[PDB]
Symmetry: C3
C-alpha cells in the first residue's frame, strides 16, 4: 500500500518516528506485510481547508484490495487519530482519498503485480 499525507504543519512538528508508526499501523490495519507499505509525508505546504489556513491534511491511500465501505471508515478513524495526536490536526480538517488499485495498474520491480 501507499499512503501520502500533505499538510501545512511545519517540518519540525512531524515526530521523528512518524513514518515508522504509519508503516506499522497501516500494516496492521490493512493486513498487508510492513515490507510492502510505502509512506510519504509532505509538510510546510501552502493549503487551505474551507478557506482557513489552520492545520489541515490532504491524504490518499492506494491499495490492491482491502478497500471498501467498512474498511475505509476504520482507516479514517486510525489515520485521523494519528494526525490529531502526532500532528495536532483536527479530524474535520482532514480529507483522505481511497483507491482500490487493480494489480495490473501497480508497477513494482520492473513489472506489475498482475
Amino acid at each position: 500500500p501507499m499512503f501520502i499525507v500533505n499538510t501545512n504543519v511545519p517540518r519540525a512538528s512531524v515526530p521523528d518516528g512518524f513514518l515508522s508508526e504509519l508503516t506499522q499501523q497501516l500494516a496492521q490495519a490493512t493486513g498487508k506485510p510492513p515490507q510492502y507499505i510505502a509512506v510519504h509525508v509532505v509538510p510546510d505546504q501552502l493549503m487551505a481547508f474551507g478557506g482557513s489556513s489552520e492545520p489541515c491534511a490532504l491524504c490518499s491511500l492506494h491499495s490492491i484490495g482491502k478497500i471498501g465501505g467498512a474498511q475505509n471508515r476504520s482507516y479514517s478513524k486510525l489515520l485521523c487519530g494519528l494526525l490529531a495526536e502526532r500532528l495536532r490536526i483536527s479530524p474535520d480538517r482532514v480529507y483522505i482519498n481511497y483507491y482500490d488499485m487493480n494489480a495490473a495498474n501497480v508497477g513494482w520491480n520492473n513489472s506489475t503485480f498482475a
Copy 2:
C-alpha cells in the same frame, strides 16, 4: 472537493489571496459549500510540459459528484482562466485530472461520507 495545483512558477509569483480565490470560485462552480473545499498549491516544482520548462501546471479536482462532460469543460475554462491571470501560465500548458469520487472512498472526520 479537493483541488491541487503543481507548478514550476516560483512561490513569490503566487498571489497572496490565491487559495481563497480558488476556494470561492470552486464553491460557486461546483455548487458545494466553501467549507468543504480544500485547495493545495505547490510551486517551485521541477517539471516539463512537451519537453519545455516554460510555466506549466499539473492539477487535479476530486469531488463526490459534480463531475461530468459538461461540468469538466467549464471547470477547465474557470481554472485555466485563474492560472493564466494569476500565475501567468498559458492554458495550453495546463493539465487537470478530474475524479468523481465515491462517497465511501472519501475519508473525513474519523469516518467516510457514505
Copy 3:
C-alpha cells in the same frame, strides 16, 4: 500523458537532462507525441518503503488509453530502468500507479479531450 516521480533522492542527484529523457522515452513507449507529455520530478521527499529510508520512488502515469496489462509491464521495465540508472534507486523500491483516464476527465486548454 502525465508522469510524476516522488523520491527521497536529493535534488543534486537528479541528472540535468532527466525530464527531457523521460519525455522522449515516454513518447516512444506510449506512442503519444512528445508535445503532450508532462513530466514532474519531486526530490528530497520524506518517505519510507517497507519501513526503510533507502532510496525509493512513488510514481504514477496517467494516460487516455495506452494503459493495460502488457503495456504496464513494459512501462515498469522502462521506468524502473531509468530510475535505477539515473537516480540509483533499486527497482524493488519503486511503485508506479497507472491510470487509464477517460478523455472527458482530462482538462486541457480551456476544455477537455472529449
